[PDB]
Design a protein around this ligand. Structure first.
Ligand code: HEM
Ligand SMILES: CCCCCCCCCCCCO[C@@H]1O[C@H](CO)[C@@H](O[C@H]2O[C@H](CO)[C@@H](O)[C@H](O)[C@H]2O)[C@H](O)[C@H]1O
Ligand code: SF4
Ligand code: SF4
Length: 742
């Protein structure tokens, strides 16, 4: 009897002490690795607005708002997660019982309610394991292939952890029954605890004689399994247990979408007019990723939520947001001895596994390189991204895939000088003519000559911004592209009908650089953005920050002029034409008098969270809006973002074709909100219709749908030169008033 009395403590304590040495030896090692990355300046090192960071950390972690969006797995994880917190109380009882069998949680160790929660969660976690187990059996990668949410994931490590949770419950159940039989009335939860009472009933026949050994065997298993399970987690892909709460603390706010962060080197922003000799552009090796970058890599849960939504992955291309993180994460660990200084420096779509081990070959691999180069990330993976944002919008742990993808592009374009040959034409056209098409700058104001109403042009006829409300910014697409130019005229006509006083910079405009920045060429973007910020700033001289209004017809201008120029000192209030037109129809300025489908632009919908305004215009125009199977924040890319408009799709199905086939199945009329969405979808309709041998679907812009519904017969738009005459009158009147006074 006494042998079991003391043996419980002798085995229990040494197991804890021995394991905590190994467990604590790796916690320092992981910390020594995650903190070995480059430091960060963004948001004061991801520390500004601290109070709001824990506010989202608690809501996203404990509330699981970010995670419950996927119903079946999120709900199961909710009980799996909260169970761990509750079962933590059990381990306190188990450890204390070693010192004395009468031990119980002093303050609450006999409260009947706490027993119900432990028992309720003791089986709720069991369901969580089953629900997770069923999903992987149904979605088996070997049975489904690339369509599987778990393709490329390490299935071996996922089942290993699920098995250990089962043992913890199985050992937990055995202890509860054994404890009741041995302790009897002295058992802490003598009342309630149905799951603990249930076990005692089945274990009762063995009697107190047998259960004396069962309790000790069960207990040592409960502590032993946990300690053995603790070591597995630290050395397994399950690291998101402790890192996930931290990766959400330092998350990019409000989300990992929107503007592209300025480049920094070793904790300092790069001065592009005087970059330092040691300045590093982009990220050409795993050591260039910041300490936050390493945290993202290790926090990946390999859930595949991002992968199931990637336009590139689902159209047959090697790119996968999951595998990019996994390949970077695995490369990070494989190269760890060289990063930490321990050694002196010397599935087919998963690029890391091309070179394995931590030998010298791992240290010499390019971060981005073809198979013959052994690179971790194939160039087709890197250049297949469209910057749609489906991965970032979907990550429960806020990994910000786009930041890593375009930070690697920055190295290729700006340092390595390697990029698809189709971007070479883009950069030469932008840097010589100011537009990606390479057309003459003098032809920018041609679209003004093709309309029959007055569109004042700053510098050309009107000398100042006085008396005007909005700067209408067209962009290269709205001035040079035949189909996009159609929308620009419609928007200008709508504003004139609504009476909004506006002007256009005309030939003083140049490319914003959204394609230039997201292709990785930030030398070009800073060269183009600086010209636009300076050009616009002169227009708004003497204009209060509130009145510095801009209206754009492209989500990319909306995203760049509004969110990325402020990094250069801008304070512009830019609004997409759908928002401006929506509140004009709201304000009864515009009076509109079979089904239609709307394609959400990823830079309008997903990045800038503009969903209701474009759809209200569609409804206000009298047509019936039919949502696609994939729409709103789960919309699909047409393949135009991230400079993919200028490259060519060699691999797999064409993204615009996949979207168009879905769009045409929904309705025969498609409404878009971007110059590039219209071009891609319109081109896709030509391919899809020809393949299907059916009449082409009508692709229009939400501005054109609104205009067609207006009864413009009663409206007389301003005659050409009307704004010029007013400018002369105001200028002449002011001159006369001052001349006659002085
Ligand atoms: C705090 C205790 C936690 C426990 C005990 C726990 C446990 C688990 C386990 C065992 C899985 C495997 C699911 C499967 O194999 O299908 C899982 C999945 C996951 N966990 Fe946790 N986790 C915890 C914390 C967190 C937190 C705070 C987050 C924050 C986002 C998180 C995010 C995820 C995600 C995204 C998945 C993937 C779910 C899926 O594949 O559908 N975990 N968790
Ligand atoms: C069961 C799983 C167990 C997981 C075990 C491993 C845990 C790893 C913990 C490390 C977490 C990252 O820890 C993070 O490190 C960074 C990098 O220095 C610190 O960063 C801090 O110092 C750096 C420089 O040293 C500054 O640039 C930064 O502005 C400042 O915040 C963060 O304050 C800290 O939050
Ligand atoms: S990157 Fe995020 S969404 Fe994708 S598998 Fe990893 S944890 Fe899941
Ligand atoms: S941004 Fe879109 S295309 Fe790029 S990796 Fe993420 S999901 Fe794929």
């Amino acid at each position: 009897a006494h042998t079991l009395e003391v043996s419980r403590l002798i085995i229990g304590l040494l197991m804890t002490a021995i394991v905590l040495v190994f467990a604590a030896k790796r916690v320092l090692w992981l910390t020594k690795l995650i903190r070995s990355g480059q430091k960060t300046l963004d948001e004061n090192g991801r520390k500004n607005d601290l109070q709001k960071r824990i506010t989202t950390q608690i809501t996203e972690v404990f509330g699981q708002t970010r995670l419950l969006r996927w119903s079946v797995p999120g709900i199961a994880h909710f009980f799996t997660m909260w169970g761990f917190f509750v079962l933590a109380s059990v381990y306190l009882e188990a450890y204390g019982v070693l010192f004395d069998p009468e031990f119980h949680i002093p303050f609450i160790g006999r409260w009947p309610v706490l027993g119900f929660l432990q028992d309720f969660f003791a089986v709720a976690v069991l369901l969580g394991i089953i629900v997770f187990a069923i999903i992987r059996v149904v979605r088996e990668p070997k049975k489904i292939g690339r369509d599987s949410r778990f393709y490329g994931s390490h299935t071996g490590g996922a089942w290993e952890i699920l098995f250990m949770i089962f043992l913890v419950i199985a050992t937990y159940a055995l202890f509860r029954g054994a404890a009741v039989n041995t302790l009897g009335e002295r058992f802490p939860y003598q009342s309630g605890a149905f799951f603990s009472d249930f076990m005692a009933w089945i274990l009762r026949p063995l009697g107190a004689t047998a259960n004396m050994w069962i309790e000790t065997v069960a207990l040592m298993g409960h502590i032993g399994v946990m300690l053995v399970f603790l070591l597995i987690v630290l050395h397994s892909k399950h690291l998101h247990i402790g890192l996930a709460p931290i990766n959400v603390t330092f998350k990019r706010l409000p989300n990992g979408l929107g503007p592209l962060l300025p480049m920094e080197s070793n904790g300092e922003y790069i001065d592009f007019e005087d970059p330092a000799e040691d300045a590093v552009f982009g990220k050409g090796k795993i050591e260039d990723f910041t300490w936050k970058g390493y945290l993202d890599f290790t926090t990946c849960t390999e859930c595949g939520r991002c992968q199931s939504q990637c336009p590139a992955w689902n159209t047959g291309k090697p790119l996968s947001p999951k595998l990019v993180i996994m390949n970077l994460r695995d490369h990070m660990f494989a190269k760890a001895p060289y990063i930490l200084g321990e050694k002196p420096s010397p599935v087919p779509e998963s690029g890391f596994e091309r070179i394995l081990g931590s030998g010298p070959e791992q240290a010499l691999r390019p971060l981005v390189g073809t198979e013959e180069q052994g690179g971790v990330i194939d160039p087709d993976v890197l250049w297949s991204c469209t910057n749609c944002g489906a991965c970032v919008e979907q990550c429960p742990v806020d990994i910000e895939h786009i930041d890593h993808i375009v930070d690697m592009r920055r190295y290729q374009v700006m340092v390595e000088s390697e990029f698809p040959g189709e971007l070479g034409v883009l950069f030469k056209n932008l840097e010589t003519k100011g537009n990606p098409w390479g057309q003459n700058a003098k032809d920018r104001t041609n679209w003004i000559d093709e309309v029959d109403f007055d569109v004042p042009v700053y510098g050309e006829d009107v000398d100042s911004f006085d008396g005007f409300e909005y700067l209408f910014w067209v962009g290269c697409a709205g001035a040079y592209e035949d189909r996009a130019k159609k929308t620009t005229k419609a928007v200008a006509e709508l504003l004139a009908t609504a009476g909004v006083k506006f002007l256009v910079l005309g030939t003083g405009e140049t490319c914003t650089g959204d394609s230039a920045r997201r292709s990785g060429n930030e030398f070009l973007f800073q060269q183009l953005a600086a010209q636009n910020v300076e050009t616009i700033n002169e227009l708004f001289e003497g204009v209060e920050t509130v009145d510095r209004k801009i209206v754009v017809t492209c989500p990319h201008c909306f995203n760049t002029i509004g969110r990325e120029y402020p990094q250069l000192g801008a304070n512009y209030s830019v609004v997409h034409h759908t928002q401006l037109l929506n509140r004009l129809v709201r304000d009864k300025k515009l009076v509109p008098v079979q089904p239609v489908t709307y394609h959400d632009p990823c830079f309008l919908g997903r990045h800038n969270k503009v969903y209701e305004a474009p759809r209200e215009l569609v409804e206000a125009s009298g047509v019936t809006l039919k949502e696609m199977p994939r729409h709103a924040d789960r919309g699909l890319c047409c393949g135009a973002g991230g400079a993919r408009m200028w490259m060519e799709e060699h691999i797999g199905k064409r993204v615009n074709v996949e979207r168009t086939e879905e769009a045409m199945d929904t309705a025969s009329t498609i409404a878009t909100g971007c110059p590039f969405c219209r071009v891609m979808i319109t081109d896709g309709v030509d391919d899809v219709a020809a393949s299907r041998n059916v009449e082409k679907a009508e692709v229009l812009d939400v501005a054109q749908l609104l205009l067609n519904s207006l009864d413009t017969s009663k409206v007389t738009l301003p005659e050409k030169g009307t704004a010029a005459k007013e400018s002369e009158k105001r200028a002449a009147a002011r001159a006369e008033a001052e001349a006659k006074a002085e």
